[PDB]
């Protein structure tokens, strides 16, 4: 209804793995980035490409796949080996069809979370369920970059939150119909589903190691919105005349935390800059059906006001359980950022990044009712 799945939520159900034979030249380069980058040939291959019309991408999953391919080539081309030797101009034969496909999908021409997590996965055996050991990513950047661990655990955290988003309708039917036990059961189910997502987030440490992420994988996830290396943005040759700035693909582009902010009345959604607006800016990097889900959610009556006006220590307790699960997620997430960003940057905090994350948690903490 809003491109949300029952089993995988904001994730794309069974992504396409193949593009039509017309696009083999893209697929070949995208599937061999680790070789081509290491050998210092990637840029030469990109420049030798021909302009390939997007006209033969006629279904959504194949356009999704084509954006993942083009997004990964774009990251590799711009940054190269990550040795500070950057390219400031995306060649015309890639930039035009990429920008055209991105306009059709209503996404910025940069690699986003919906590309490299939500659409970048396959089941090893389809008859066996969605667990790490039975899944693989579709593209990677450098050997030992831990893209498989980072992407798949993100996805598995995404899939765990999915089992909460399917209760969200029932929360609202229950409020409407003055249905006290249902609403209390429903909020409990959400809190327990947010709790299972926190368990799943623990799998990060045995599939990603801090140095691979911080010094290899992070390079190719970096964008050009306020980045000293491309002080002015990127030139999408033959599509726009002046450079453009787009944010690098943080997992901050996930809709999961915002979905439950909006549902719980937590005013991250609104507020003061350097915080509420970064979360608003980050909405522009999410698929359009998902942008709409978040907006429709706000239009709904407040759950926090409903629960507040009922003198019901039961409803207040279940609502607080959901608030408390959210606070744990961001707290654990603060741990994750320390190990995978701060200590490695510290070994050759110092960035307000932590004040952003901490601010967001404190807001979540101050929404507790009782
Ligand atoms: C595993 C290593 C991870 C690192 C190093 C990391 C890093 C970051 C950073 C740096 C930000 C702030 C945005 C920015 O400045 O780029 C952020 C925010 C965020 N991250 Fe991640 N992240 C990781 C994993 C995850 C995972 C698995 C999720 C699962 C949903 C997630 C969800 C979010 C969300 C929702 C935000 C927005 C801030 C908020 O709503 O609290 N992150 N993260
Ligand atoms: N080490 C440099 C150059 C480089 O890595 C590179 C990688 C793939 C294809 C071409 C490259 N540079 C010049 O042709 C860099 O950081 O981009």
Curated annotation (Swiss-Prot):
Biological process, per Gene Ontology: 'de novo' NAD biosynthetic process from L-tryptophan; female pregnancy; inflammatory response; kynurenic acid biosynthetic process; L-tryptophan catabolic process; L-tryptophan catabolic process to kynurenine; multicellular organismal response to stress; negative regulation of interleukin-10 production
MF-aspect GO terms: electron transfer activity; heme binding; indoleamine 2,3-dioxygenase activity; metal ion binding; tryptophan 2,3-dioxygenase activity
Swiss-Prot/TrEMBL cofactor(s): heme b
Cofactor binding summary note: Binds 1 heme group per subunit. In the active form, the heme iron is in its ferrous state Fe(+2). The catalytic cycle does not alter the oxidation state of the heme, but IDO1 is prone to autoxidation.
Residues the entry annotates as binding heme b: 333
Coiled coil: none
InterPro entries: Indolamine_dOase, Trp/Indoleamine_2_3_dOase-like
A cellular component annotation (GO) from this entry: cytoplasm
Chief subcellular location: cytoplasm
Enzyme class: oxidoreductase
EC annotation from Swiss-Prot or TrEMBL: 1.13.11.52
Record-linked Pfam families: IDO
Reaction(s) catalysed by this chain's protein: D-tryptophan + O2 = N-formyl-D-kynurenine; L-tryptophan + O2 = N-formyl-L-kynurenine
UniProt cross-references to SUPFAM superfamilies, sorted A to Z: Indolic compounds 2,3-dioxygenase-like (SSF140959)
Cell compartments where the protein resides: Cytoplasm, Cytosol
Notes on activation and inhibition: Activity is inhibited by and MTH-trp (methylthiohydantoin-DL-tryptophan), modestly inhibited by L-1MT (1-methyl-L-tryptophan) but not D-1MT (1-methyl-D-tryptophan).
This protein's pathway: Amino-acid degradation; L-tryptophan degradation via kynurenine pathway; L-kynurenine from L-tryptophan: step 1/2
Distribution of this protein across tissues and organs: Expressed in mature dendritic cells located in lymphoid organs (including lymph nodes, spleen, tonsils, Peyers's patches, the gut lamina propria, and the thymic medulla), in some epithelial cells of the female genital tract, as well as in endothelial cells of term placenta and in lung parenchyma. Weakly or not expressed in most normal tissues, but mostly inducible in most tissues. Expressed in more than 50% of tumors, either by tumoral, stromal, or endothelial cells (expression in tumor is associated with a worse clinical outcome). Not overexpressed in tumor-draining lymph nodes.
Keyword terms, alphabetized: Cytoplasm, Dioxygenase, Heme, Immunity, Iron, Metal-binding, Oxidoreductase, Tryptophan catabolism
Swiss-Prot/TrEMBL induction comment: By IFNG/IFN-gamma in most cells. Exogenous inflammatory stimuli induce the expression of IDO1 in antigen-presenting cells such as dendritic cells, macrophages and B-cells.
Note: IDO1 is the target for therapy in a range of clinical settings, including cancer, chronic infections, autoimmune and allergic syndromes, and transplantation.
Described function: Catalyzes the first and rate limiting step of the catabolism of the essential amino acid tryptophan along the kynurenine pathway. Involved in the peripheral immune tolerance, contributing to maintain homeostasis by preventing autoimmunity or immunopathology that would result from uncontrolled and overreacting immune responses. Tryptophan shortage inhibits T lymphocytes division and accumulation of tryptophan catabolites induces T-cell apoptosis and differentiation of regulatory T-cells. Acts as a suppressor of anti-tumor immunity.
Subunit comment: Monomer.
Family named by the database record: Belongs to the indoleamine 2,3-dioxygenase family.
Protein name from the UniProt record: Indoleamine 2,3-dioxygenase 1
Biological source species: Homo sapiens (Human)
């Amino acid at each position: 209804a809003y491109h949300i799945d029952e089993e995988v939520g904001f994730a794309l159900p069974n992504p396409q793995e193949n593009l039509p034979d017309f696009y083999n030249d893209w697929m070949f380069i995208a599937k061999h980035l680790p070789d081509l980058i290491e050998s210092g040939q990637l840029r030469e291959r990109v420049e030798k490409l021909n302009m390939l019309s997007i006209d033969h991408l006629t279904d959504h999953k194949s356009q999704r796949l084509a954006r993942l391919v083009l997004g990964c080539i774009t990251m590799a081309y711009v940054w190269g080996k990550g040795h500070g030797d950057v390219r400031k101009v995306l060649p015309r034969n890639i930039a035009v069809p990429y920008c055209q496909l991105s306009a059709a999908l209503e996404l910025p021409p940069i690699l986003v979370y919906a590309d490299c997590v939500l659409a970048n996965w396959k089941k090893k055996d389809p008859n066996k369920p969605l667990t790490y050991e039975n899944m693989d990513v579709l593209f990677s950047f450098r050997d030992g970059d831990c893209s498989k661990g980072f992407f798949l655990v993100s996805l598995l955290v995404e899939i765990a939150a999915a089992s909460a988003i399917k209760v969200i309708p029932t929360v609202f039917k229950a409020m409407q119909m003055q249905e006290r036990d249902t609403l209390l059961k429903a909020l409990l189910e959400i809190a327990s589903c947010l709790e299972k997502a926190l368990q799943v987030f623990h799998q990060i440490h045995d599939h990603v190691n801090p140095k691979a992420f911080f010094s290899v994988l992070r390079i190719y996830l970096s964008g050009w919105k306020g980045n000293p290396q491309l002080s002015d943005g990127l030139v999408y040759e033959g599509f726009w005349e002046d450079p453009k700035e787009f944010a690098g693909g943080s997992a901050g582009q996930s809709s999961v935390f915002q979905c439950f902010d909006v549902l719980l009345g937590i005013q991250q959604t609104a507020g003061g800059g350097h915080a509420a607006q970064f979360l608003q800016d980050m909405r522009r990097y999410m698929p359009p059906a998902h942008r709409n889900f978040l907006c429709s959610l706000e239009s709904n009556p407040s759950v926090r006001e409903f629960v507040l006006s009922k003198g019901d220590a039961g409803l207040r307790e279940a609502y607080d359980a959901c608030v408390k699960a959210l606070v744990s997620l961001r707290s654990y997430h603060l741990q994750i950022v320390t190990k995978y960003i701060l200590i490695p940057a510290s070994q050759q905090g110092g960035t307000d990044l932590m004040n952003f994350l901490k601010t967001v948690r404190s807001t979540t903490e101050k929404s507790l009712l009782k």
